[PDB]
Symmetry: C2
Subunit: 144 residues, 2 copies
């Protein structure tokens, strides 16, 4: 399976150099479960990642998010796994108020990946939070 | 192959803006290598110590120039092969023997920030080539 966020950060920082870090991210991506051919459709497409990206978020029998995704770009799929780890086992509202910025700063991703890659990472985060917000946002009564 | 010359190659590396762009450029250089002749890929032209399958075939044409072709099992290593071919482009065996690559690898910081084996594999292919070059350099061309 995928390590929790605490272990991800510790293993990442334990890598002796950036090639090891880069291949570790890709390795995690390859560990993601296969995406149902049925879910690999436009409805689940994410734009702005310089590649094909698919992400599906659904709530189980309880109110906890279950995330699945894929990318035709290995490094992008790895970033998908990194975000899944950080948002793992959270309710929609937990995802909305969870600040991931400090985790990425510690990993120093934006400083080692291409700007285009970093933008793709921001796009998926924004897309996941958007989906989490649509499930928890307030429909204020003064707006009915 | 259609690749920049040493001089251009170096400038290109200097322009890389981040670890990833540089890493992928090395992979790109490998992707620019012509495919090896169907089974030119022999245990003979096999290089060892590159933490992967590496093949390099050396040839000397009618003009005494060394022509090199290669391929690797690992994309990054194949990029390192491409770099080596560019450095030795259009050289005679003797040229390859007295060419000090050290200053070039140093300015490119080629294997820096890569896993340890990369610089080991790089050293492997260089000694392999220099070895063959020296052998040929003892038997001189015409003039």
């Amino acid at each position: 399976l995928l390590p929790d966020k605490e272990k991800l950060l510790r293993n990442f920082l334990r890598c002796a150099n950036w090639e090891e870090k880069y291949l570790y991210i890709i390795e995690l991506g390859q560990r993601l479960p296969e995406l149902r051919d049925e879910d690999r459709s436009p409805q689940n497409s994410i734009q702005g990642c310089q590649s094909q990206v698919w992400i599906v978020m659904r709530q189980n029998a309880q109110g906890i998010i279950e995330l699945q995704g894929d990318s035709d770009a290995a490094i992008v799929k790895g970033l998908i796994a990194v975000v899944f780890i950080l948002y793992d086992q959270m309710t929609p509202q937990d995802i909305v108020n969870f600040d991931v910025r400090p985790w990425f700063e510690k990993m120093a991703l934006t400083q080692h990946l291409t700007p285009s890659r970093s933008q793709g990472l921001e796009a998926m985060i924004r897309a996941i939070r958007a989906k989490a917000a649509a499930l928890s946002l307030e429909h204020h009564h003064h707006h009915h």
